Amino acid sequence: INSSSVSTALKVAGAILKFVNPPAGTVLTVLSAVLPILWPTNTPTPERVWNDFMTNTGNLIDQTVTAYVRTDANAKMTVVKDYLDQYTTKFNTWKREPNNQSYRTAVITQFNLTSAKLRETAVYFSNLVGYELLLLPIYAQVANFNLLLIRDGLINAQEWSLAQSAGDQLYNTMVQYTKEYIAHSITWYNKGLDVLRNKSNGQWITFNDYKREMTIQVLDILALFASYDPRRYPADKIDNTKLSKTEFTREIYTALVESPSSKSIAALEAALTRDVHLFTWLKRVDFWTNTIYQDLRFLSANKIGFSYTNSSAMQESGIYGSSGFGSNLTHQIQLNSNVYKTSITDTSSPSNRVTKMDFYKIDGTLASYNSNITPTPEGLRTTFFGFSTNENTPNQPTVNDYTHILSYIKTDVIDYNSNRVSFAWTHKIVDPNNQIYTDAITQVPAVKSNFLNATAKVIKGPGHTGGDLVALTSNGTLSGRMEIQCKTSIFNDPTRSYGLRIRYAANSPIVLNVSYVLQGVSRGTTISTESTFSRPNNIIPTDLKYEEFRYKDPFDAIVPMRLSSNQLITIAIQPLNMTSNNQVIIDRIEIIPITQSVLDET
User: Fold this and answer.
1) Where can this protein be found?
2) For residues 313 and 325, what is the distance between their CA atoms, to the nearest angstrom?
3) Which of 115, 364, 379, 413 yields a CA-CA distance of 20 to 30 A from 459?
4) Of 345, 358, 343, which is closest to residue 297 (Cα–Cα)?
5) What is the DSSP secondary structure assignment for residue 83, as one 8-state letter?
């Protein structure tokens, strides 16, 4: 549902793939000529019907009013984009001649007007009672712009006025708004979720559609907020629009499910999705076919071969589906290239009797499962799954516009020969090399580790971190340990210095042993966390707040990691002398290039 949102809900905030900013230099790509792309029209063709269930859709009157609310909201966003365009035009003029006080005053004036308007609109979209869920997606976008603009004020605070102080107040405002925007979004995401989870005869497919769209349109945006803090992540001097890249490690699902389904939402969730886990990469898909009757050959089960990031080992899943007599392993497909689109063919009625599945790879090839049923039954239908930035091709992206790749497949038996088949997808922004960039702060979520000891485990993320987390706990005997391997980029210097930072939450001041291994040589240090949160009976937190995450720097400008070019580095984290109730939850590690600027910031 809604194709012009599950494509452009990260297309505007995704126009920055590398070099796309104005800070000095000829520009004719993003910044300039942005008018004919930012807000060409508004909303000529139909869209967004999902997430409207909290409004009265029982009658045409309320539905018509709700339609107007959506139209008015799009008009207000167009107004917001125009304010931003005026800001950008004045900023660029100023940047080309910073000493011209007329250009300076002009951009400052526009910054104030645009900032006020953005805040104002976010407040409106979150306080129109009875429409908060409906407006959550647009709210997130406005919230996103508001924080991005504030960041700019902080970046140019010194050049535009008495450095900080009036910037410290602005900084506090940025932090306050970040918390507000995240709190509102998480609160409503969950209310909508509860409504769907509580509906009688609630269909899992509807529940899942909701989570997938919210993830793409709201949750992923929230994950970017932390990176906007310019004190924590200094702006690229060559071009301020460049940001420390944030990865969304969460998996979203698409599935072929019988309709209607009498199986519960909880039952299908357990059967079609994966328990929290370290990020995995899909390497092989095994398929079984029921072969007793040739004219009744259909998919019967599947298994997955996968690997953790930068791991050389092939992990094997259990068998999903049926593997008794008559069920035979007929396919083992090595997916040497990312799969950006899939299709599945099944009979119409009874439905879900799968005869074929196609897997489109980015290298231009196609892999397929085929039951080889003969003769070919009538009433076959084919359903495509995939994520495109092109709203005109909802489930059929091309190699040039897909946003996700296949990460998993699970089969759940309905009746003999009939199954529900779910496809898990991960965002293409996730780096398979955990590459340490040379010119920006590199983010590497903890779930991209490839080793966890007995007392370290992945736990559900609160919804605003872009994925799940790694909890290092204590057995009273063994302290949780995580290992994550990263690849340095190629550079000429024999060695370069990098600081190592950790974004985490902890329920007490705990000593952490942090080390990095390069060609078998291990170097380590110790650093203590702060107490950032606490919960009743020390239960592992499922609702960590933005403010409950903090930062610590085991390695810095004084004692940096010394890394050589194009090597595999193993970073390990493990608490020291930890008590049975101590908890250290890692969101992600961050590698910071040590330059002269950071030489002063350390």
Assistant:
1) Spore
2) 31
3) 413
4) 345
5) H
Are the CB atoms for 332 and 283 separated by under 8 Å? no
Residue type for position 586: I
Contacts for 26 with CB less than 8 Å, ≥ 6 apart: none
Separation in Å, CA 521 to CA 177, 286, 515: 44, 39, 10
Q: How many domains does the chain have?
A: 3
214/307 same-domain check: no
Distance CA 65, CA 470 (A): 45
The Cα 520–Cα 168 span in angstroms is: 45
We report the CATH number of the domain holding residue 461 as 2.60.120.260
Confirm if 254 and 204 have CB atoms less than 8 A apart. no
CA distances from 272 to 321, 354, 539 (A): 11, 16, 27
- Check whether the bond before 350 is cis (ω within 30° of 0): yes
- The residues pairing with 496 across neighbouring beta strands, listed in sequence order, are 563
Interatomic CA distance for residues 385 and 423, integer angstroms: 8
Report how far residue 39's alpha carbon sits from residue 428's, in angstroms, rounded to the nearest whole number.
26
Residues 6+ apart with CB under 8 A from 568: 310, 485, 486, 487
At what resolution in Å was this solved? 2.0
Question: Experimental method used, please?
Answer: X-ray
